[PDB]
Amino acid sequence: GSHMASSEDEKLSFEAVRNIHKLMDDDANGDVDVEESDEFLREDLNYHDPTVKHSTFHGEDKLISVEDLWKAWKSSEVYNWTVDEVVQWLITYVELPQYEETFRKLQLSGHAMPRLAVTNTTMTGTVLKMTDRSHRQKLQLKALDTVLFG
Ligand SMILES: [Ca+2]
């Protein structure tokens, strides 16, 4: 229920993908500016310094763009990763040994990566990490870093 992110009608994949981009881009204008990402990129997904994602994605600067992410994602390792790949990925990165249940519940992959990187609500089909914050933290950190860097 917001124009910015999460619109009420039906959660489309674009609003979702821009939402996880919006994790960095506070105002969600389609591109994150350096100031917008200040704590956000660094910690919220890079868990240290966002120089990696900023200078890897843009290269010359620090601006990340939703549609550009869309194009990047389709060209990145993430969009190529099938369920098996994502399963080993989710475990080795997200540290969620609930993989059996979750993959059999929703069948995740490179599409699911951005779709699950936003809120527990989306990803928890039935039973998947009781801890909301711990769930969304692990998933957003690794899924988002995966859709962004890969
Ligand atoms: Ca912005």
XYZ file of C-alpha atoms and ligand atoms in Angstrom:
151
model
C 0.000 0.000 0.000
C 2.419 2.604 -1.270
C 3.182 4.190 -4.664
C 6.880 3.782 -3.967
C 6.961 0.071 -3.255
C 4.315 -2.602 -2.742
C 1.194 -1.476 -4.528
C -2.205 -3.003 -3.746
C -3.669 -4.908 -6.656
C -1.356 -7.743 -7.155
C 2.298 -7.797 -6.363
C 3.946 -7.800 -9.719
C 7.570 -8.794 -10.171
C 8.606 -5.287 -11.239
C 7.366 -3.524 -8.100
C 9.028 -6.333 -6.189
C 12.370 -5.958 -7.985
C 12.251 -2.149 -7.566
C 11.368 -2.744 -3.901
C 14.517 -4.731 -3.222
C 16.410 -2.035 -5.211
C 14.535 0.473 -2.989
C 16.273 -1.196 -0.014
C 19.189 0.937 -1.243
C 17.230 3.634 -3.015
C 15.225 5.151 -0.185
C 12.923 7.267 -2.349
C 12.803 4.575 -4.986
C 13.155 6.850 -7.947
C 14.599 4.053 -9.958
C 18.172 4.917 -9.132
C 19.979 5.020 -5.908
C 22.120 7.992 -5.260
C 25.171 7.840 -3.043
C 23.399 9.643 -0.201
C 20.379 7.388 -0.395
C 22.383 4.253 0.011
C 24.537 5.711 2.877
C 23.846 3.093 5.562
C 21.691 1.024 3.249
C 23.880 -0.571 0.621
C 26.840 -0.932 3.014
C 25.310 -2.756 5.795
C 21.893 -3.756 4.660
C 23.327 -6.022 2.007
C 27.069 -5.600 1.769
C 27.495 -6.115 5.563
C 30.716 -4.061 5.455
C 31.489 -1.616 2.670
C 29.322 -1.089 -0.421
C 32.273 -0.186 -2.592
C 32.029 -3.685 -3.983
C 28.479 -3.338 -5.196
C 28.665 0.336 -6.089
C 31.808 0.127 -8.174
C 31.003 -3.322 -9.524
C 27.557 -2.359 -10.748
C 28.026 1.188 -11.956
C 31.753 1.046 -12.201
C 32.577 4.652 -12.545
C 30.178 5.805 -9.866
C 27.802 4.536 -7.288
C 24.349 4.764 -8.886
C 22.299 1.593 -9.064
C 19.177 1.603 -11.270
C 16.098 -0.738 -11.087
C 15.645 -1.358 -14.772
C 19.380 -1.553 -15.146
C 19.305 -4.185 -12.417
C 16.570 -5.919 -14.377
C 18.850 -6.037 -17.455
C 21.869 -6.883 -15.277
C 20.009 -9.658 -13.459
C 19.045 -11.262 -16.760
C 22.749 -11.170 -17.684
C 24.006 -12.142 -14.252
C 24.678 -15.584 -12.758
C 21.480 -15.222 -10.738
C 19.021 -15.417 -13.655
C 20.844 -18.502 -14.930
C 20.600 -20.331 -11.617
C 17.965 -23.034 -11.546
C 16.431 -24.573 -8.398
C 19.396 -26.942 -7.728
C 21.841 -24.065 -8.026
C 19.727 -21.778 -5.866
C 19.336 -24.559 -3.305
C 23.070 -24.986 -2.863
C 23.381 -21.242 -2.983
C 20.746 -20.581 -0.377
C 22.320 -23.032 1.960
C 25.971 -22.024 1.418
C 25.066 -18.348 1.608
C 21.768 -17.825 3.344
C 22.550 -20.636 5.806
C 19.001 -21.865 5.672
C 18.923 -25.690 6.007
C 15.187 -25.527 5.372
C 16.024 -25.831 1.704
C 14.212 -29.128 1.180
C 10.940 -27.750 2.358
C 11.240 -24.342 0.797
C 12.285 -25.518 -2.641
C 9.532 -28.138 -2.631
C 7.093 -25.425 -1.431
C 7.752 -22.657 -3.914
C 10.629 -23.860 -6.138
C 13.045 -21.045 -5.971
C 15.630 -19.986 -8.523
C 17.045 -16.813 -10.080
C 13.519 -15.362 -10.425
C 12.671 -16.310 -6.945
C 15.866 -14.690 -5.659
C 14.584 -11.102 -6.150
C 11.002 -12.163 -5.464
C 12.075 -13.600 -2.064
C 14.553 -10.804 -1.242
C 11.645 -8.670 -0.092
C 9.739 -9.479 3.180
C 9.180 -12.926 4.787
C 5.563 -12.779 3.604
C 6.474 -13.491 0.020
C 8.917 -16.337 0.586
C 7.392 -18.263 3.501
C 5.095 -20.738 1.794
C 4.423 -22.615 4.991
C 7.281 -23.189 7.386
C 10.414 -21.226 6.742
C 12.431 -19.674 9.593
C 10.311 -18.654 12.612
C 12.433 -15.570 13.122
C 11.048 -12.888 10.775
C 14.014 -10.661 10.974
C 16.516 -13.433 10.827
C 14.674 -14.873 7.836
C 14.398 -11.664 5.908
C 17.916 -10.638 6.908
C 19.557 -13.782 5.588
C 17.391 -13.923 2.526
C 17.639 -10.228 1.678
C 21.409 -10.135 2.286
C 22.247 -13.060 0.144
C 19.423 -12.900 -2.419
C 19.832 -9.225 -2.954
C 23.636 -9.481 -3.147
C 22.996 -12.312 -5.612
C 20.565 -10.342 -7.828
C 22.906 -7.402 -7.701
C 26.428 -8.895 -7.808
C 25.848 -12.616 -8.190
Ca 16.556 7.555 -5.019
